[PDB]
From Swiss-Prot:
GO terms for cellular component: extracellular region. Changing residue 71 to T: Decreased catalytic efficiency and affinity for uridine (CpU substrate). Altered substrate specificity from uridine specific to guanosine specific. GO terms for biological process: RNA catabolic process. RNA binds at residues 9, 34, 71-72, 74, 80, 83-84, 87-88. Keywords: Disulfide bond, Endonuclease, Hydrolase, Lyase, Nuclease, Signal. It comes from Momordica charantia (Bitter gourd). This is Ribonuclease MC. Gene3D superfamilies: Ribonuclease T2-like. The keyword Manganese does not apply.
């Protein structure tokens, strides 16, 4: 792999697309971790053969993980961590074992406070229209590089909502680099 995509999601927006059934994320008011995806040639590496998920290897991080990496769609956190490790984590196992991988994600989250970067410039979430250029600019100002913005379109109203923010990292897992792909248009609701 040549880089990492550190993906954070906005729980309320994510759950807004679940028009049936429960969605624990409906009540969260902070960006949470979706995942840390190893990349190669502008594409996500997935389902690499590797070690099976082992909860005892990340036992010392259970408090941080339950707070920062909750399953927002269902009330089973461990299953979410297991799914993310098997689908993405195994692809960077040659240099980051399971314990270091989850620690990386937690550290990244603690060092990339999205709302904290937006709040002072009146760009915090308020269910109103925001500009892709403005949001990317504010984040670049605070963190030094351009983030990747991901959106989803409501099938009923055709309105676009910001659901995830990506921070791109070099393969060392600490050097921030510019992201180059957004799925958001010029404007979206946040």
């Amino acid at each position: 792999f040549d880089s990492f995509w550190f993906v954070q999601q906005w729980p309320p927006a994510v759950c807004s697309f679940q028009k049936s059934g429960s969605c624990p994320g409906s009540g969260l008011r902070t960006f949470t971790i979706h995942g840390l995806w190893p990349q190669q040639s502008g594409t996500s590496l997935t389902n690499c053969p590797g070690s099976p998920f082992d909860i005892t290897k990340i036992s010392h991080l259970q408090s941080q993980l339950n707070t920062l990496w909750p399953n927002v769609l269902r009330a089973n956190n461990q299953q979410f961590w297991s799914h993310e490790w098997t689908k993405h984590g195994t692809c960077s196992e040659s240099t980051f074992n399971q314990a270091a991988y989850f620690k990386l994600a937690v550290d990244m989250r603690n060092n990339y406070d999205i709302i904290g970067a937006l709040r002072p410039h009146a760009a915090g979430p308020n269910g109103r229209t925001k500009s892709r250029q403005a949001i990317k600019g504010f984040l670049k100002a605070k963190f030094g590089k351009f983030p990747g913005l991901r959106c989803r379109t409501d099938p009923q109203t055709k309105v676009s909502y910001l659901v995830q923010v990506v921070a791109c990292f070099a393969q060392d897992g600490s050097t921030l680099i510019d992201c180059t792909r957004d799925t958001c248009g010029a404007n979206f609701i946040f």
